[PDB]
Design a binder for this molecule. Structure first.
Ligand code: MNR
Ligand SMILES: O=[N+]([O-])c1ccc(O)cc1
Length: 137
C-alpha cells in the first residue's frame, strides 16, 4: 500500500525522484516556465546537472516525509502550510502540484511494480486541497 511505497521510493530515491520529475517535465513541457535552467537539455544531460539532481532529490526527500506524516493519504496541515509559505514556492498555484502528481501516478501505473497508484492519486488530490486551504491560489 501507500506506506510500503514510501519505503520503496526511499530505497532508490535519487533515481525515482529524477525519473518522476523528468516524466512531469516531459508530459507538461510548459512547466519549465518555473525551471528556466532546465530548458534545452535531454534527460541524460539533466541527470549530469548538479542542481537538477540535488534539488529534485531534496524535493522528494521532503515529499516522502509529508507522505509519511500523513494519515490515510491526508497530509498534516503544518506540512501544507510549509509548502505554501516557502519562498521557493512564491507564485506557484495548485495546478503545478496537481500536474506533478498526475505524472507520478502515471509513472507508477506504467511500472511493473505493485505501487498503490490509487493512494498516490488520493494523496495528490488531498495535498492540493490542503494547499488551497492553507492559502495557495
Ligand atoms: C511545478 C512546480 C513545483 C511543484 C509541483 C513543487 C512541489 C514540491 C513538492 C511536492 C509535494 C515538495 C515536497 C517540494 C519541496 C521543495 N521544493 Mn518545490 N516542492 N520548488 C519549485 C517548484 C515546485 N515544487 C521551485 C521553482 C523551486 C526552487 C527553485 C528550484 O529549486 O528549482 C522549489 C524548491 C523546493 C525545495 C528546495 C530544493 C533545494 O533548494 O534544493 C523543496 C525541499
Ligand atoms: O520535483 N520537483 O517538483 C522539483 C524538482 C527540481 C527542482 O529544482 C524543483 C522542483
Amino acid at each position: 500500500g501507500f506506506k510500503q511505497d514510501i519505503a520503496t521510493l526511499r530505497g532508490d530515491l535519487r533515481t525515482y525522484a529524477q525519473d518522476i520529475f523528468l516524466a512531469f517535465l516531459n508530459k507538461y513541457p510548459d512547466e519549465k516556465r518555473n525551471f528556466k535552467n532546465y530548458v534545452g537539455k535531454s534527460d541524460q544531460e539533466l541527470k549530469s546537472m548538479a542542481k537538477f539532481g540535488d534539488h529534485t532529490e531534496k524535493v522528494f526527500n521532503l515529499m516522502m516525509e509529508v507522505a509519511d506524516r500523513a494519515t490515510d493519504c491526508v497530509p498534516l496541515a503544518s506540512d501544507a502550510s510549509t509548502l505554501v509559505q516557502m519562498k521557493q514556492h512564491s507564485g506557484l498555484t495548485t495546478g503545478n502540484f496537481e500536474k506533478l502528481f498526475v505524472a507520478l501516478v502515471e509513472y507508477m501505473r506504467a511500472s511493473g511494480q505493485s505501487f498503490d497508484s490509487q493512494s498516490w492519486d488520493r494523496f495528490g488530490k488531498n495535498l492540493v486541497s490542503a494547499l488551497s486551504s492553507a492559502g495557495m491560489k
